Amino acid sequence: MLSHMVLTRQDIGRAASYYEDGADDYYAKDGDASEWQGKGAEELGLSGEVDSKRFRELLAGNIGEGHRIMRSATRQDSKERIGLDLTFSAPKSVSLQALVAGDAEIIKAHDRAVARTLEQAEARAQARQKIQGKTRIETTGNLVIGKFRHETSRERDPQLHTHAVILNMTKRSDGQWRALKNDEIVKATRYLGAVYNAELAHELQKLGYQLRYGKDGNFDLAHIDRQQIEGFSKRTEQIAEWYAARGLDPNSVSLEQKQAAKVLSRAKKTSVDREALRAEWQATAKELGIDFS
Protein backbone atom coordinates (compact mmCIF):
# COMPACT_ATOMS: atom_id res chain seq x y z
CA MET A 1 0.00 0.00 0.00
CA LEU A 2 1.20 3.51 -0.84
CA SER A 3 -0.42 6.70 0.41
CA HIS A 4 0.80 10.22 -0.11
CA MET A 5 0.16 13.41 1.75
CA VAL A 6 1.40 16.86 0.95
CA LEU A 7 2.89 18.44 4.08
CA THR A 8 2.20 22.10 4.85
CA ARG A 9 3.22 24.22 7.86
CA GLN A 10 0.38 22.90 10.04
CA ASP A 11 1.83 19.39 9.57
CA ILE A 12 5.39 20.35 10.52
CA GLY A 13 4.59 19.11 14.01
CA ARG A 14 3.69 15.68 12.63
CA ALA A 15 7.26 15.66 11.31
CA ALA A 16 8.16 14.98 14.94
CA SER A 17 6.21 11.73 15.22
CA TYR A 18 8.44 10.31 12.48
CA TYR A 19 11.17 10.25 15.11
CA GLU A 20 9.02 9.13 18.06
CA ASP A 21 9.78 5.53 17.11
CA GLY A 22 6.46 4.42 15.71
CA ALA A 23 8.86 1.52 15.35
CA ASP A 24 10.49 -0.14 18.33
CA ASP A 25 12.60 -3.30 18.30
CA TYR A 26 14.54 -2.46 15.13
CA TYR A 27 14.56 1.25 15.99
CA ALA A 28 17.23 0.44 18.57
CA LYS A 29 20.14 0.95 16.16
CA ASP A 30 19.12 -2.39 14.63
CA GLY A 31 19.49 -1.42 11.00
CA ASP A 32 18.43 1.93 12.46
CA ALA A 33 14.91 3.18 11.76
CA SER A 34 15.90 6.35 9.86
CA GLU A 35 18.00 6.81 6.72
CA TRP A 36 18.54 9.61 4.17
CA GLN A 37 18.08 8.87 0.46
CA GLY A 38 18.37 10.62 -2.88
CA LYS A 39 20.93 12.22 -5.16
CA GLY A 40 19.78 15.52 -3.67
CA ALA A 41 20.62 14.30 -0.17
CA GLU A 42 24.04 13.19 -1.42
CA GLU A 43 24.39 16.66 -2.93
CA LEU A 44 23.93 18.11 0.57
CA GLY A 45 26.34 15.63 2.11
CA LEU A 46 23.77 13.48 3.90
CA SER A 47 23.82 9.73 4.42
CA GLY A 48 22.99 7.23 7.14
CA GLU A 49 20.73 8.02 10.10
CA VAL A 50 18.57 11.13 9.75
CA ASP A 51 19.48 14.02 12.05
CA SER A 52 16.47 15.44 13.88
CA LYS A 53 18.09 18.87 13.80
CA ARG A 54 19.10 18.93 10.14
CA PHE A 55 15.79 17.35 9.10
CA ARG A 56 13.85 20.03 10.98
CA GLU A 57 15.89 22.65 9.15
CA LEU A 58 15.30 21.18 5.70
CA LEU A 59 11.61 20.95 6.57
CA ALA A 60 11.78 24.67 7.25
CA GLY A 61 13.58 25.24 3.97
CA ASN A 62 17.13 25.88 5.14
CA ILE A 63 20.09 24.23 3.40
CA GLY A 64 22.46 26.13 5.68
CA GLU A 65 25.64 26.10 3.56
CA GLY A 66 25.48 29.81 2.77
CA HIS A 67 22.07 29.79 1.09
CA ARG A 68 18.94 31.85 1.69
CA ILE A 69 15.66 30.42 2.98
CA MET A 70 13.64 28.66 0.27
CA ARG A 71 10.06 29.08 -0.87
CA SER A 72 9.96 32.82 -0.14
CA ALA A 73 7.87 33.17 -3.33
CA THR A 74 5.00 31.42 -1.57
CA ARG A 75 1.92 33.62 -1.69
CA GLN A 76 1.00 34.58 1.87
CA ASP A 77 -2.62 33.60 1.15
CA SER A 78 -1.44 30.03 0.49
CA LYS A 79 0.09 27.20 2.51
CA GLU A 80 3.86 26.82 2.70
CA ARG A 81 4.67 23.26 1.63
CA ILE A 82 7.42 21.56 3.57
CA GLY A 83 7.32 18.21 1.85
CA LEU A 84 5.51 15.21 0.47
CA ASP A 85 4.87 12.18 2.63
CA LEU A 86 4.88 8.80 0.88
CA THR A 87 3.90 6.05 3.30
CA PHE A 88 4.64 2.44 2.35
CA SER A 89 2.79 -0.19 4.36
CA ALA A 90 3.45 -3.89 3.90
CA PRO A 91 0.77 -6.58 3.71
CA LYS A 92 -0.42 -7.71 7.15
CA SER A 93 0.95 -11.27 6.91
CA VAL A 94 4.29 -9.74 5.95
CA SER A 95 4.25 -7.53 9.05
CA LEU A 96 3.42 -10.62 11.13
CA GLN A 97 6.20 -12.73 9.63
CA ALA A 98 8.76 -10.01 10.35
CA LEU A 99 7.59 -8.58 13.69
CA VAL A 100 5.78 -11.44 15.43
CA ALA A 101 7.72 -14.48 14.16
CA GLY A 102 10.77 -12.23 14.07
CA ASP A 103 12.56 -12.24 10.69
CA ALA A 104 14.94 -9.34 10.11
CA GLU A 105 15.28 -10.37 6.45
CA ILE A 106 11.66 -9.33 5.89
CA ILE A 107 12.59 -5.91 7.27
CA LYS A 108 15.43 -5.70 4.76
CA ALA A 109 13.07 -6.88 2.01
CA HIS A 110 10.72 -4.04 2.88
CA ASP A 111 13.54 -1.49 3.03
CA ARG A 112 14.76 -2.50 -0.42
CA ALA A 113 11.28 -2.46 -1.93
CA VAL A 114 10.96 1.05 -0.51
CA ALA A 115 14.38 2.26 -1.65
CA ARG A 116 13.93 1.02 -5.21
CA THR A 117 10.56 2.69 -5.46
CA LEU A 118 11.98 6.01 -4.23
CA GLU A 119 14.64 5.81 -6.98
CA GLN A 120 11.70 5.79 -9.39
CA ALA A 121 9.94 8.66 -7.64
CA GLU A 122 13.22 10.56 -7.85
CA ALA A 123 13.35 10.13 -11.64
CA ARG A 124 10.10 12.12 -11.57
CA ALA A 125 11.46 14.97 -9.44
CA GLN A 126 10.82 18.27 -11.19
CA ALA A 127 11.33 21.98 -10.75
CA ARG A 128 10.18 25.03 -12.63
CA GLN A 129 12.25 27.83 -14.15
CA LYS A 130 11.24 31.03 -15.90
CA ILE A 131 13.14 32.91 -18.64
CA GLN A 132 11.78 36.21 -19.96
CA GLY A 133 8.29 35.32 -18.80
CA LYS A 134 8.38 31.89 -20.40
CA THR A 135 7.97 29.06 -17.90
CA ARG A 136 9.49 25.61 -18.37
CA ILE A 137 9.37 22.39 -16.39
CA GLU A 138 12.66 20.68 -15.62
CA THR A 139 13.10 17.04 -14.66
CA THR A 140 15.85 17.48 -12.09
CA GLY A 141 16.03 13.86 -11.06
CA ASN A 142 17.15 14.66 -7.52
CA LEU A 143 15.35 14.44 -4.19
CA VAL A 144 16.24 14.80 -0.51
CA ILE A 145 14.41 12.10 1.43
CA GLY A 146 14.13 11.27 5.09
CA LYS A 147 12.96 7.67 5.59
CA PHE A 148 11.48 6.56 8.91
CA ARG A 149 10.53 2.93 9.57
CA HIS A 150 7.82 2.11 12.12
CA GLU A 151 6.28 -1.16 13.30
CA THR A 152 2.87 -0.64 14.91
CA SER A 153 -0.62 0.59 14.02
CA ARG A 154 -2.68 2.94 16.19
CA GLU A 155 -4.16 -0.15 17.83
CA ARG A 156 -0.70 -1.61 18.54
CA ASP A 157 -1.06 -4.33 15.92
CA PRO A 158 2.07 -5.30 13.92
CA GLN A 159 2.21 -2.80 11.04
CA LEU A 160 5.47 -2.60 9.11
CA HIS A 161 5.67 0.72 7.33
CA THR A 162 7.99 3.51 6.32
CA HIS A 163 7.33 7.21 6.01
CA ALA A 164 9.34 8.51 3.07
CA VAL A 165 9.30 12.24 3.65
CA ILE A 166 10.28 13.92 0.42
CA LEU A 167 11.41 17.41 1.25
CA ASN A 168 10.04 20.27 -0.85
CA MET A 169 13.35 20.96 -2.59
CA THR A 170 15.36 20.06 -5.66
CA LYS A 171 18.55 21.25 -7.41
CA ARG A 172 18.26 22.42 -11.03
CA SER A 173 20.96 22.17 -13.72
CA ASP A 174 21.94 25.79 -13.13
CA GLY A 175 22.75 24.75 -9.56
CA GLN A 176 19.74 26.48 -7.94
CA TRP A 177 17.57 24.83 -5.29
CA ARG A 178 13.85 25.25 -5.94
CA ALA A 179 10.56 23.96 -4.62
CA LEU A 180 9.57 20.57 -5.97
CA LYS A 181 6.95 20.43 -8.73
CA ASN A 182 5.22 17.32 -7.37
CA ASP A 183 2.73 16.69 -10.20
CA GLU A 184 4.59 13.67 -11.56
CA ILE A 185 5.23 11.98 -8.21
CA VAL A 186 1.76 12.73 -6.86
CA LYS A 187 -0.02 11.50 -9.98
CA ALA A 188 2.23 8.40 -10.05
CA THR A 189 1.19 7.22 -6.58
CA ARG A 190 -0.79 4.19 -7.77
CA TYR A 191 1.99 3.18 -10.15
CA LEU A 192 4.64 3.60 -7.42
CA GLY A 193 2.54 1.47 -5.10
CA ALA A 194 2.67 -1.34 -7.67
CA VAL A 195 6.43 -0.95 -7.96
CA TYR A 196 6.64 -1.33 -4.17
CA ASN A 197 4.36 -4.35 -4.24
CA ALA A 198 6.36 -5.97 -7.06
CA GLU A 199 9.73 -5.26 -5.45
CA LEU A 200 8.50 -6.54 -2.09
CA ALA A 201 7.09 -9.71 -3.63
CA HIS A 202 10.33 -10.33 -5.47
CA GLU A 203 12.34 -9.89 -2.28
CA LEU A 204 10.01 -12.19 -0.34
CA GLN A 205 10.20 -14.93 -2.92
CA LYS A 206 14.02 -14.82 -2.78
CA LEU A 207 13.79 -15.59 0.93
CA GLY A 208 11.69 -18.60 0.05
CA TYR A 209 8.13 -17.45 0.78
CA GLN A 210 5.08 -18.44 -1.22
CA LEU A 211 2.69 -15.59 -2.01
CA ARG A 212 -1.08 -15.71 -2.35
CA TYR A 213 -2.39 -12.98 -4.66
CA GLY A 214 -5.95 -11.83 -4.18
CA LYS A 215 -8.44 -10.16 -6.49
CA ASP A 216 -7.06 -6.65 -5.84
CA GLY A 217 -3.59 -7.51 -7.10
CA ASN A 218 -2.29 -7.45 -3.56
CA PHE A 219 -0.74 -10.36 -1.72
CA ASP A 220 -0.05 -11.99 1.62
CA LEU A 221 2.17 -14.91 2.57
CA ALA A 222 0.43 -18.21 1.74
CA HIS A 223 0.66 -19.78 5.20
CA ILE A 224 -1.59 -17.16 6.84
CA ASP A 225 -5.33 -17.02 6.14
CA ARG A 226 -7.78 -14.14 6.13
CA GLN A 227 -9.25 -14.74 9.59
CA GLN A 228 -5.74 -14.72 11.02
CA ILE A 229 -4.97 -11.46 9.24
CA GLU A 230 -8.15 -9.84 10.54
CA GLY A 231 -7.21 -10.83 14.08
CA PHE A 232 -4.24 -8.46 13.80
CA SER A 233 -6.17 -5.81 11.87
CA LYS A 234 -8.08 -3.88 14.55
CA ARG A 235 -8.08 -0.50 12.80
CA THR A 236 -9.63 -2.23 9.79
CA GLU A 237 -12.37 -3.63 12.01
CA GLN A 238 -12.94 -0.20 13.59
CA ILE A 239 -13.35 1.36 10.15
CA ALA A 240 -15.74 -1.37 9.09
CA GLU A 241 -17.77 -0.81 12.26
CA TRP A 242 -18.07 2.88 11.49
CA TYR A 243 -19.52 2.20 8.03
CA ALA A 244 -21.91 -0.35 9.52
CA ALA A 245 -23.11 2.10 12.18
CA ARG A 246 -23.69 4.67 9.44
CA GLY A 247 -25.49 2.14 7.27
CA LEU A 248 -22.92 2.94 4.59
CA ASP A 249 -21.67 0.60 1.89
CA PRO A 250 -17.86 0.37 1.76
CA ASN A 251 -18.25 -0.48 -1.93
CA SER A 252 -19.22 3.13 -2.65
CA VAL A 253 -18.40 5.89 -0.17
CA SER A 254 -17.44 9.50 -0.85
CA LEU A 255 -13.95 10.63 0.12
CA GLU A 256 -15.57 12.55 2.96
CA GLN A 257 -17.21 9.41 4.34
CA LYS A 258 -14.06 7.33 3.90
CA GLN A 259 -11.79 9.86 5.64
CA ALA A 260 -14.46 10.40 8.29
CA ALA A 261 -14.48 6.67 9.08
CA LYS A 262 -10.67 6.49 9.21
CA VAL A 263 -10.13 9.54 11.41
CA LEU A 264 -13.24 9.37 13.63
CA SER A 265 -12.90 5.66 14.37
CA ARG A 266 -9.46 6.25 15.88
CA ALA A 267 -9.15 5.61 19.60
CA LYS A 268 -6.93 7.30 22.20
CA LYS A 269 -3.18 7.06 21.47
CA THR A 270 -1.66 5.38 24.54
CA SER A 271 1.92 4.18 25.04
CA VAL A 272 2.94 0.53 25.38
CA ASP A 273 5.71 -1.80 26.53
CA ARG A 274 7.46 -3.05 23.38
CA GLU A 275 8.69 -6.05 25.34
CA ALA A 276 5.21 -6.94 26.60
CA LEU A 277 3.55 -6.07 23.29
CA ARG A 278 5.50 -8.67 21.32
CA ALA A 279 4.60 -11.35 23.87
CA GLU A 280 0.99 -10.33 23.37
CA TRP A 281 1.40 -10.60 19.59
CA GLN A 282 2.86 -14.07 19.98
CA ALA A 283 0.13 -15.24 22.35
CA THR A 284 -2.52 -13.83 19.99
CA ALA A 285 -0.86 -15.54 17.01
CA LYS A 286 -1.07 -18.95 18.70
CA GLU A 287 -4.74 -18.40 19.58
CA LEU A 288 -5.48 -17.56 15.95
CA GLY A 289 -3.78 -20.85 15.07
CA ILE A 290 -0.98 -19.21 13.09
CA ASP A 291 2.00 -21.30 12.05
CA PHE A 292 4.95 -19.02 11.31
CA SER A 293 6.52 -21.96 9.52
Added chain:
DNA sequence: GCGCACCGAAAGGTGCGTATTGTCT
Protein backbone atom coordinates in the same frame (compact mmCIF):
# COMPACT_ATOMS: atom_id res chain seq x y z
C1' DG B 1 -1.85 24.49 -13.21
C1' DC B 2 -5.03 22.56 -17.34
C1' DG B 3 -2.39 28.95 -16.10
C1' DC B 4 -3.50 32.17 -12.66
C1' DA B 5 -2.58 35.14 -8.75
C1' DC B 6 0.04 36.39 -5.86
C1' DC B 7 5.12 36.37 -3.45
C1' DG B 8 9.60 38.60 -3.52
C1' DA B 9 13.14 40.81 -6.31
C1' DA B 10 16.40 36.82 -9.71
C1' DA B 11 12.56 40.13 -17.66
C1' DG B 12 12.47 35.62 -10.90
C1' DG B 13 9.15 31.96 -7.76
C1' DT B 14 5.18 29.66 -5.47
C1' DG B 15 0.89 27.64 -4.20
C1' DC B 16 -2.98 25.64 -6.40
C1' DG B 17 -4.78 20.74 -7.93
C1' DT B 18 -3.03 16.41 -8.17
C1' DA B 19 -4.33 11.86 -5.15
C1' DT B 20 -9.12 7.70 -5.23
C1' DT B 21 -6.28 -0.21 -3.44
C1' DG B 22 -5.26 -1.85 2.32
C1' DT B 23 -2.45 -4.05 6.12
C1' DC B 24 -5.37 1.80 7.22
C1' DT B 25 -2.17 9.37 9.95
